[PDB]
């Protein structure tokens with residue numbers, strides 16, 4: 627990727643997560659838990675959709691016959707036509723293969739950005755209550771029950787109501 | 799060369815009369831005269847194929 631979180635520090639994907647594209651997986655006292663993040667996943671899907679809506683259902687122009695498959699046209703004009711057509715085919719073949727590489731390069735980096743945007747946003751919610759190991763994880767330094775986890779997800783985490791507790795364990 | 803039993807050939811020529819203009823044929827032989835003229839009804843598309851409709 628370009629933002630290094632699709633191959634950089636998230637080592638691998640989660641084949642079990644079919645809820646969405648990006649999501650949370652926590653661990654705490656009550657146990658394990660996995661959920662997907664809608665606001666991010668839909669932000670990339672709405673973007674791929676833009677590309678598809680741009681390449682598909684184009685209303686191409688109307689063209690007519692200048693050749694004849696049954697009664698071949700005159701030679702000198704038949705070559706100017708064969709030649710011209712062969713040239714345009716070069717352009718479109720080039721335009722087609724280049725456009726996909728441009729788009730496929732963009733989509734692959736575009737998804738990174740959505741991962742890094744999620745990651746670097748959750749980190750700000752946990753201002754000084756947690757530290758990031760660097761594997762795509764957040765080591766939380768207070769009791770975070772399954773309600774506290776869901777607090778993070780829908781962005782209700784009040785960093786203040788855990789800070790003094792968290793800062794204590796942070797330095798000892 | 800023989801085609802449909804005839805070694806003669808007819809050469810078909812054509813022009814397009816504009817409205818209110820006049821076409822005139824002088825001929826003392828070897829003429830295949832038109833009986834009816836032809837007008838275009840609209841727009842369409844022609845193709846060449848050998849498959850079912």
Ligand SMILES: *[C@@H]1O[C@H](CO)[C@@H](O)[C@H](O)[C@H]1NC(C)=O
Nearest residue numbers: 698700701702703704705708
């Ligand atoms: C032009 O190309 C067609 C096939 O696309 C071929 O059949 C035809 O012989 C060509 N004409 C000339 C003059 O090369």
Ligand SMILES: *[C@@H]1O[C@H](CO)[C@@H](O)[C@H](O)[C@H]1NC(C)=O
Nearest residue numbers: 814815816817818819820821
């Ligand atoms: C052709 O002539 C007729 C009358 O003879 C006239 O009504 C008509 O406008 C003319 N059309 C053109 C294109 O000159």
